[PDB]
Write a protein that binds this ligand. Structure first.
Ligand SMILES: Nc1ncnc2c1ncn2[C@@H]1O[C@H](COP(=O)(O)OP(=O)(O)OP(=O)(O)O)[C@@H](O)[C@H]1O
Length: 255
């Protein structure tokens, strides 16, 4: 069958994943060019939800022309009943790709880390702190990671392995995103997130906020990489490294 978006027929190759009231479709336009179409049903959406959906559409549309490490939004159609978003089509999300891989090319890890910083840097430059970063938020598109959401979408099996200590103690600033990026890199380096071994979630959160629970950093060839991980995973936000600092770090600069 088909989807019309702004008077353009797209044909559905398949559904990517399988959401409820939100659905992503791999599609082709008339000229057989591939896109991804996000469909959202709005009939059960309150005003606050609608407001945040529009806000994320606004920022995604706006930040596009600043970085190609943000997913390209070509067009959208928005009424009171639904939303269609025509988007650049990616191969696979970072989480799915990591799950089926024992190791990673050291060069590729570094390259992906550059992309992530560029993307997160960009949203910071327009006042947006994501605050819920995890590998699923990134999409591989021609050997590039692209950030596919900004975490503005509201009440639309979780995970707390990427959560920064200051969010837990507070019961959040650009540094919060650095911690999570730090957990994503740690994972790509050591094959597991820092506190992955703690299956009890209440304990896990205590482990994250506990100074006396020291995070292990097994020695590796890339001593720069090791340093990046230590700097990103410093519990005190003030002591934690910023994104502009990470962009000047040897790990990302030195060939
Ligand atoms: N622009 C895009 N290009 C390619 N794939 C995409 C794009 N946007 C989203 N996807 C993929 O579509 C899938 C959507 O799955 P689904 O609708 O079940 O939601 P989810 O992301 O798995 O979780 P939730 O729906 O709860 O957010 C995800 O696996 C995601 O990687």
């Amino acid at each position: 069958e088909c989807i019309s978006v702004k008077g353009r027929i797209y044909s559905i190759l398949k559904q990517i994943g399988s959401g409820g009231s939100s659905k992503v479709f791999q599609v082709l336009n008339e000229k057989k060019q591939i896109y991804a179409i996000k469909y959202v049903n709005l009939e059960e959406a309150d005003n606050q939800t609608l407001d945040s959906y529009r806000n994320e559409i606004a920022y995604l549309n706006k930040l596009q022309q600043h970085s190609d490490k943000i997913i390209r939004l070509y067009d959208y159609e928005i009424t009171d009943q639904y939303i269609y978003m025509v988007m650049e089509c990616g191969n696979i999300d970072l989480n799915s790709w990591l799950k089926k891989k024992k190791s990673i090319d050291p060069w590729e890890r570094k390259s992906y880390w550059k992309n992530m910083l560029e993307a997160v840097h960009t949203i910071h430059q327009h006042g947006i702190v994501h605050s819920d970063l995890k590998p699923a938020n990134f999409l591989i598109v021609d050997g590039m990671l692209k950030l596919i959401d900004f975490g503005i979408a509201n009440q639309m099996v979780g995970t707390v392995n990427y959560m920064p200590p200051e969010a837990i103690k507070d019961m959040i600033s650009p540094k919060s995103d650095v911690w999570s990026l730090g957990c994503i890199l740690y994972y790509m380096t050591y094959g597991k997130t820092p506190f992955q071994q703690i299956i009890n979630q209440i304990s896990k959160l205590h482990a994250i906020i506990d100074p006396n629970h020291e995070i292990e950093f097994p020695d590796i060839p890339e001593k720069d990489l090791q340093d990046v991980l230590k700097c990103c995973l410093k519990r005190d936000p003030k002591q934690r490294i910023s994104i502009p600092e990470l962009l000047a770090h040897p790990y990302v600069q030195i060939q």
